[PDB]
């Protein structure tokens, strides 16, 4: 297992695996939804569905290729997959359809049909997908009036004002050679890829992207979307967390692993070594929860999400969870830290060593764009093993004890108390 970075004008990164049976080749750009403004929000999500449109997918399918695309807050990628003996055809398809010609894809008949399909997807997301849209509303209240607040899909109000000239204006500012990384994963050797690119003279455009002026900033706030005709309540809560390239990046992920995830209907999930589960199962305070530690280029979020049918005891669920977060400053034990070390290593090993080269192409390109290289899994395991109890207590005294929070919620949330009752539970008046 080894990565190889090489620059000749174009940054080329590979990750060779001679045991895999497919190969994957694409390009990742270093702009996401946090490089848009409130008037062209959704222009990245439209560029994805233009690339995945029917006439473009049909040209690829006669060659034997498949297409993927992903939109995030800091990056976006466009990936072609094939059998290991036809990576030259997949690199040709990325040259013709995406680099040279774009007036074929941006015809008026293709643009209006794609815009209709995207507007239906965003409408069905806002009406049916309740856990993921509460987490989207948590980002917009915590980073309000700041580039990290814009949703990755766009809104229905901002998507209908978009024309063809808005997509060409975004492509001239961000789809550049100094913003791009060419990636290759699966069964493909590194020097075979750099000689196929150098046998041509690929270059997107010369110049740099615009520089935004407002930096990300956390604000303690809340947003409530009450809907009494829904059968549950869905709640997210977080503090300000760690960015990428932070010295406390792995300590924050281990602290979330201490409290973990839960499913009340799976019998083995009920037997986990988490002390919070004693209070919750006595009166059945929720159906599921999960803790997270998200990281971006400038900021991050640390907290949990939950879903509940017990709508008269919502205040007991928030109170018991926040009293366990107080113990990370005061009285976290050594056996809880050793359990979280083994489970964080199992979770990280499953994320980076799945058998999908499309997942590996997204992870490799996003990390080379920020850091310039990639940290191996062997070196990440040695940083996790060196964390002590005193590292956890010093991190939680800075980020958790007596700090501001952000709350989002939907459904039957009448039993959720107001902000200052929840804010005062971030300290004990004992220590």
């Amino acid at each position: 297992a080894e990565v190889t970075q090489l620059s000749n004008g174009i940054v080329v990164a590979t990750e060779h695996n001679p045991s895999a049976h497919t190969a994957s080749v694409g390009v990742v750009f270093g702009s996401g939804a946090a490089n848009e403004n409130p008037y062209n929000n959704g222009v990245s999500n439209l560029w994805k569905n233009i690339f995945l449109s029917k006439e473009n997918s049909a040209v690829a399918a006669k060659e034997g290729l498949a297409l993927s695309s992903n939109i995030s807050r800091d990056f976006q990628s466009y990936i072609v997959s094939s059998l290991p003996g036809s990576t030259d055809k997949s690199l040709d398809f990325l040259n013709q359809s995406f680099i040279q010609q774009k007036a074929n894809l941006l015809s008026s008949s293709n643009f209006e049909a794609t815009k209709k399909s995207v507007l239906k997807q965003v409408q069905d997301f806002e009406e049916n997908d309740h856990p993921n849209r509460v987490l989207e509303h948590l980002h917009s209240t915590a980073f309000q009036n700041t580039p990290l607040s814009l949703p990755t899909r766009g809104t229905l109000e901002s998507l209908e004002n978009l024309v063809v000239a808005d997509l060409e204006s975004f492509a001239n500012n961000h789809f550049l050679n100094s913003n791009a990384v060419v990636v290759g994963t699966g069964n493909i050797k590194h020097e075979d890829l750099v000689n196929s690119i150098e046998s041509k003279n690929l270059s997107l455009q010369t110049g740099t992207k615009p520089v935004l002026k407002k930096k990300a900033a956390f604000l303690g706030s809340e947003v409530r979307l009450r809907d009494d005709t829904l059968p549950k309540a869905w709640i997210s809560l977080a503090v300000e967390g760690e960015p990428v390239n932070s010295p406390n990046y792995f300590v924050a992920k281990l602290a979330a692993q201490i409290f973990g995830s839960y499913n009340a209907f799976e019998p083995a999930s009920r037997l986990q070594g988490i002390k919070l589960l004693d209070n919750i199962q006595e009166y059945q305070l929720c159906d599921n929860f999960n803790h997270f530690s998200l990281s971006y280029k400038d900021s991050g979020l640390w907290g949990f999400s939950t879903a509940t049918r017990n709508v008269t005891m919502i205040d007991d669920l928030i109170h018991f969870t926040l009293k366990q977060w107080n113990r990370l400053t005061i009285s976290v034990t050594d056996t809880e830290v050793e359990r979280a070390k083994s489970l964080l290593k199992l979770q990280l090993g499953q994320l980076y060593e799945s058998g999908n080269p499309v997942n590996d192409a997204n992870l490799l390109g996003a990390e080379v764009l920020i850091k310039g290289s990639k940290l191996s899994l062997g070196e990440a395991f040695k940083k996790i093993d060196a964390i002590t109890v005193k590292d956890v207590k010093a991190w939680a005294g800075k980020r958790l004890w007596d700090q501001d929070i952000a709350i989002a919620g939907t459904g039957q949330i009448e039993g959720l108390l107001d902000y200052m009752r929840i804010r005062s539970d971030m300290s004990m008046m004992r220590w």
Partner: protein, 44 residues
């Protein structure tokens, strides 16, 4: 290993609480510090 779990008086939690019982037994000995001085008596 593990030992006598004390029921709920966990010792692993006693001296994870009791170093601040030098100030919690000291907050109410900081209390009669105030509330005993309307009549003369001295004691160290």
């Amino acid at each position: 290993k593990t030992g006598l779990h004390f029921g709920r008086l966990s010792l692993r939690s006693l001296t994870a609480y009791a170093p601040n019982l030098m100030l919690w037994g000291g907050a109410s000995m900081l209390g009669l510090f105030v509330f005993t001085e309307g009549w003369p008596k001295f004691q160290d």
